[PDB]
Amino acid sequence: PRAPRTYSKTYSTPKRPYESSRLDAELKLAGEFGLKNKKEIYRISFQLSKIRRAARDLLTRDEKDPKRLFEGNALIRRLVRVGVLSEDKKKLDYVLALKVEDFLERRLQTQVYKLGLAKSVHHARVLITQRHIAVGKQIVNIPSFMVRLDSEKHIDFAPTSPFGGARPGRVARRNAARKAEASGE
Amino acid sequence: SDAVTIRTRKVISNPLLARKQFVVDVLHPNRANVSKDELREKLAEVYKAEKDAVSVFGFRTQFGGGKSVGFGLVYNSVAEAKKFEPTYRLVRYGLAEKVEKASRQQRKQKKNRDKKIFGTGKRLAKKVARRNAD
Amino acid sequence: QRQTTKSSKRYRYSSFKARIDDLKIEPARNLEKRVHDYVESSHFLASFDQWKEINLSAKFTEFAAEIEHDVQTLPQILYHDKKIFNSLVSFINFHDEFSLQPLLDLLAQFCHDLGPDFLKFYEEAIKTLINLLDAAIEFESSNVFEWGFNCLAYIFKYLSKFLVKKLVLTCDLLIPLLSHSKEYLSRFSAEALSFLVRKCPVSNLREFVRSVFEKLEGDDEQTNLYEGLLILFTESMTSTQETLHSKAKAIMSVLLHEALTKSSPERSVSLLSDIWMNISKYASIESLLPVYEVMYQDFNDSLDATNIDRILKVLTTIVFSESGRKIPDWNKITILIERIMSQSEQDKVAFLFALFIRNSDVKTLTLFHQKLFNYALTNISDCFLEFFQFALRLSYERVFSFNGLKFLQLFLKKNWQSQGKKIALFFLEVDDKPELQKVREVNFP
Amino acid sequence: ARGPKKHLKRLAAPHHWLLDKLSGCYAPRPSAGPHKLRESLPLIVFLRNRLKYALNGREVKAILMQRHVKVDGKVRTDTTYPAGFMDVITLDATNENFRLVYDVKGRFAVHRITDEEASYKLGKVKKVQLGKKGVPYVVTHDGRTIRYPDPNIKVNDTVKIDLASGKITDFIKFDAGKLVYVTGGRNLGRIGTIVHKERHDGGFDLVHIKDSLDNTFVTRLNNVFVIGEQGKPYISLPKGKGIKLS
Amino acid sequence: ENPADKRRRLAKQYLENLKSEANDILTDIIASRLKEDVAEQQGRVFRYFGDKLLISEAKQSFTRVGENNLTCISCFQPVLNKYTFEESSNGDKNKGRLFAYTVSKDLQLTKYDITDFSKRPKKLKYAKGGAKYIPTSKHEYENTTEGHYDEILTVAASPDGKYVVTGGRDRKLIVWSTESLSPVKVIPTKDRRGEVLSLA
RNA sequence: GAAACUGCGAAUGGCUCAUUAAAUCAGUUAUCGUUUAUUUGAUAGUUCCUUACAUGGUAUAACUGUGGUAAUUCUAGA
């Protein structure tokens, strides 16, 4: 006796698990994008599979069908604002041409590494979770964050970081205390 | 350096319960979590009412700090504050008193026993006294 | 039996008359974070903004429209005073309960800003206030009364000096409210005028008290104005928590003088009696003392005139008030008694000695009883029996431990042929009471 | 179940109250009164959930007991009073009158209302009979009984009612070409003019209605409610004026 | 003796002045003047001298300055308050002394008097930054040396006349007390590329 | 304001799925075939009619007091 929350699984293991072309596919993806889990890859794979099934059904509908027009325009603007789809390809056909690398390229850790706040994809991952990179005004410590367009313009170091702001971290000021004390003695 | 800001939004003047009810934004950078006492002091300064009339509650600090958001009430007179505020929030502010009461278990147990006694009981007390005394 | 052991609960009922009887007036006795006293870009404008945010009513919304367009700054007030005042009075005359708290509040503040220029509106400001108060009676609202009389109190507070200088006109303006045929109108209007009179200095106070007593002879038939003055003066003197103050003693002096004047009304003397009764009941003796010395000194100043019965009146009041626990010095009282006896060289007289016997101290009765009874048998001859029965009924054992029997005997010896009927009536009365055994065993001529 | 129910779950509520599905387990079951269970708005759902003048049930009870709220001129202190349709709820300390009328989306829309319009109320004449001692009476759509009506007031009509006196100022006959408000089913909230009344004997009469953009729909007589003549409604219509668009 | 009475006195003096000036103009009007003095905070343009100006006869005057590449300027003008009635300026020597402050890439702050609209801006006082204020850490939040060491870029004079505040490429922001030009407080912008580009 | 009488609630809630295969239940009807506390709206001069209405009557509780039983939310007599 209350109303039950709605939950939902966010991924789905692919059809035939062990298939060497896909094993190497996941290897290349995880390596070049800094991921850690066939589960993260499957999360993106599931999202995109759902998207493309939506688009395909709309295509099979008739041109100018009201349902197609409404839902399709919604989907296209959602992807364009996510940044996956370029402006000039506002068509459900390019939606069908999307891919997993596009979604991973939108993830946050990739965007840090690209914009240069980090030196490697793993440096970037660590920073994000270390609470060093704030989007706009708001610290973000989720590496999967899918920056939008203007947001990817606004990423920076957080005003609390020893890197973009306040007093240096504990190791640095402990070392400083050590050196000042040793100079005193 | 450290300059707390108090600002209000969504002010709704509710004269039914004789108050103004609004939403408070507190900007604290390089600081944690401004106190409700200081919030009430400064809100009273701004709204020209008495710290006994002002009341705030429900303050949540956003992820990353520097800003917390809450709800606030500013009653028309300390009279109406005492008239309408809940006992618990008055108790928090020290306007009312904490009542002492037993636990729920003791209360319900005393209730059941007294349910088992009819009348005023004092003749029962005398009767058991003498029945033992025999 | 007023509600005295509060119920545990939180929302009681409190009917209208209960609220009003619990209501009082003084704001300085009251206190809180007053907005206008707080912020200072202009008092009227301060209250005006607070209220525009707080009050959401048709009349005040209209009024706020017009005036917020006009006023925003003190020079603008000073320039456009009349238009603002007419607007306020227009709405107050509209008499709308939801808008009156802001309208009256703004009126008080408007005077506060405009002080010594407000007098040219003062008269019809007050007219509008009294009309509002009677209409409020019609549509009972204790909140309305609280607001209205506080507006009056504040207007007096802000225009203290000028009103004090021209005091009596204020009393003429308020006399509808003062003598109004409703307890609480009398009560509240008198409390406001009480603040003002206590503020007033001595000379204008003398003029005022003369004028008001002659007004009392004007409304000799009326009693309402009478207790209106009663409650006014008594509050003006007792204003503090348990202790009247220096202005109160000056008030007592001026009233006592202007009642002892031979042109003063004897009903006014009764009024002073009542005031003293209330003060004696209220304050404590240590506080009362300077009043006592002032009164004794004033009696010593002017006891010697045809006002002797008047002095009797006031002194009977003093002795009866409550008791010796408020009486400082029965010895001084005795000095006054014998001095008045010498000056006299009647019924009030018997009443006075009876109260003296009942209420005075044994250590003074020891050395004054003899002269007291001699005074009785000398001056109040025919009434002495009146007296002695009255004393018996008040407190017999005091005279019995003292010499009731011997003085009764000697009175019988001195005179029996004038009022033997009265003597018989007295004895007829006293036979039944079993506490009068000594009176049964007195002797006869 | 052996008697009347006194509780209402939260999922089981009327949907048009817009009650969140997590704040609790129970919804205000509206007390018995003028309007039916499912087409009424209780005073707590109106004072707390719509007006946001309260934050609690205990705040709503404080307001009512302080005696501010009047539902059709009379002061109502029941916190689950079933305020219904075409109702007038006045909050004087705020100087507001509210006609409760439907929004296009189906839900009750607040409709701010002036004093001279809060003075009256429309009611759908719904049962005309001959009462005891031979006085005839009308029964409107919110319980109200009104005696000595005009003889020309027939079932399914509208009567404009002075609230201050419980009397009938005037009326409107149910004929084609009047303006119609709709109160049930898929189209509720849609105002149009009444084109045809297809009448079945023993079944349900249907009505064909046509809104200002000449879009036609078919509803039941149970759900039609006559408002005013063409182009002039007797009440003030909420914004959008009952036009469903894309 | 009372604050309310004092405010009444000042206001009535204001009215005496207004009536005298209205008579002067003569040789509605008072309400209009009061309404304008109000009308400042309602933000609609009211000051409509758009065409009363005499541009062709405007009197022009250059005044050379020593340092090179003046970057920016800020002028301070005392007004008279309308809530109270004292003045805008701070001290009592001033009594309506119009000031100007110029900041130059050469790291110079220069205050001039421009009170007289017929003589050249007179160079009252100045303060020059330079290299001796370079921070010894150079690599932290704290940047708080009491002077500029690079390219002062904007200046703004406080409307109450007590301070003037300058900022530039050194990523600092310094408030000076006006009279002695003395640096009273320094606030870093605490960002590696947080250069101040404008002040208002 | 304890006790007790009077009024109201205790028929809702919560729990389980044993029974039940045109039964339940689902959608759809009818009551011109019936009861309805409550809510809400209306609604009750009867002037007279042969020999207290400034307001009839008796009880009972709690209580005082006398008791019974191993014992219960037992209860007797006055």
From Swiss-Prot, chain A:
A GO molecular-function descriptor: rRNA binding
Protein task: Component of the ribosome, a large ribonucleoprotein complex responsible for the synthesis of proteins in the cell. The small ribosomal subunit (SSU) binds messenger RNAs (mRNAs) and translates the encoded message by selecting cognate aminoacyl-transfer RNA (tRNA) molecules. The large subunit (LSU) contains the ribosomal catalytic site termed the peptidyl transferase center (PTC), which catalyzes the formation of peptide bonds, thereby polymerizing the amino acids delivered by tRNAs into a polypeptide chain.
Stated name of the protein: Small ribosomal subunit protein uS4A
PANTHER family cross-referenced by the UniProt entry: 30S 40S RIBOSOMAL PROTEIN, 40S RIBOSOMAL PROTEIN S9
Gene3D superfamilies according to UniProt: RNA-binding S4 domain
Subunit structure: Component of the small ribosomal subunit (SSU). Mature yeast ribosomes consist of a small (40S) and a large (60S) subunit. The 40S small subunit contains 1 molecule of ribosomal RNA (18S rRNA) and 33 different proteins (encoded by 57 genes). The large 60S subunit contains 3 rRNA molecules (25S, 5.8S and 5S rRNA) and 46 different proteins (encoded by 81 genes). Interacts with snoRNA U3. uS11 interacts with MPP10. Component of the ribosomal small subunit (SSU) processome composed of at least 40 protein subunits and snoRNA U3.
TM ranges: none
Disordered, as annotated region: 159-185
Record-stated family: Belongs to the universal ribosomal protein uS4 family.
Phosphoserine found at: 183
Leader peptide range in chain numbering: none
Glycyl lysine isopeptide (Lys-Gly) (interchain with G-Cter in ubiquitin) cross-link site: 179
From Swiss-Prot, chain C:
Annotated family: Belongs to the UTP20 family.
Subunit structure: Interacts with snoRNA U3. Interacts with MPP10. Component of the ribosomal small subunit (SSU) processome composed of at least 40 protein subunits and snoRNA U3.
Origin superkingdom: Eukaryota
Subcellular location(s) of the protein: Cytoplasm; Nucleus, Nucleolus
Annotated HEAT repeat ranges: 224-261
Residues of the full protein shown: 4 to 454 of 2493
Name used for this protein in its record: U3 small nucleolar RNA-associated protein 20
Coiled coil (residue ranges): none
Role, per record: Involved in nucleolar processing of pre-18S ribosomal RNA and ribosome assembly.
Disulfide bonds: none
Gene for this chain: UTP20
Curated annotation (Swiss-Prot), chain D:
Pfam families: 40S_S4_C (PF16121), KOW (PF00467), Ribosomal_S4e (PF00900), RS4NT (PF08071), S4 (PF01479)
One Gene Ontology cellular component: cytoplasm
Keyword Phosphoprotein in annotation: yes
Domain S4 RNA-binding: 41-104
Residue numbers bearing the Phosphothreonine modification: 114
GO biological-process terms attached to the record: cytoplasmic translation; translation
List of residues that carry Phosphoserine: 31, 246
SMART domains, per database record: S4 (SM00363)
Principal place of residence: cytoplasm
Compartments where located: Cytoplasm
UniProt xrefs under InterPro entries: KOW (IPR005824), Rib_uL2_dom2 (IPR014722), Ribosomal_eS4 (IPR000876), Ribosomal_eS4_C (IPR032277), Ribosomal_eS4_central_region (IPR013845), Ribosomal_eS4_central_sf (IPR038237), Ribosomal_eS4_KOW (IPR041982), Ribosomal_eS4_N (IPR013843)
Molecular functions (GO terms): RNA binding; rRNA binding; structural constituent of ribosome
Cross-linked sites for Glycyl lysine isopeptide (Lys-Gly) (interchain with G-Cter in ubiquitin): 61, 133, 160, 167, 173, 178, 210, 232
Disulfide-bond pairs as recorded: none
Miscellaneous comment in the UniProt entry for this protein: Present with 573 molecules/cell in log phase SD medium.
Similarity annotation: Belongs to the eukaryotic ribosomal protein eS4 family.
Function: Component of the ribosome, a large ribonucleoprotein complex responsible for the synthesis of proteins in the cell. The small ribosomal subunit (SSU) binds messenger RNAs (mRNAs) and translates the encoded message by selecting cognate aminoacyl-transfer RNA (tRNA) molecules. The large subunit (LSU) contains the ribosomal catalytic site termed the peptidyl transferase center (PTC), which catalyzes the formation of peptide bonds, thereby polymerizing the amino acids delivered by tRNAs into a polypeptide chain.
Protein name: Small ribosomal subunit protein eS4A
Upper taxonomic lineage: Eukaryota, Fungi, Dikarya, Ascomycota, Saccharomycotina
UniProtKB/Swiss-Prot annotation, chain E:
WD repeats: 147-186
Cell location: Nucleus, Nucleolus
Quaternary structure (record): Interacts with UTP25. Component of the ribosomal small subunit (SSU) processome composed of at least 40 protein subunits and snoRNA U3.
Additional note from the record: Present with 5130 molecules/cell in log phase SD medium.
Domain writeup: The WD domains are required for nucleolar localization and U3 small nucleolar RNAs binding.
Family note: Belongs to the WD repeat RRP9 family.
Role, per record: Involved in nucleolar processing of pre-18S ribosomal RNA. Required for efficient pre-rRNA cleavage at sites A0, A1 and A2, and biosynthesis of 18S rRNA.
UniProt protein name: Ribosomal RNA-processing protein 9
Species in which this protein is naturally found: Saccharomyces cerevisiae (strain ATCC 204508 / S288c)
Gene: RRP9
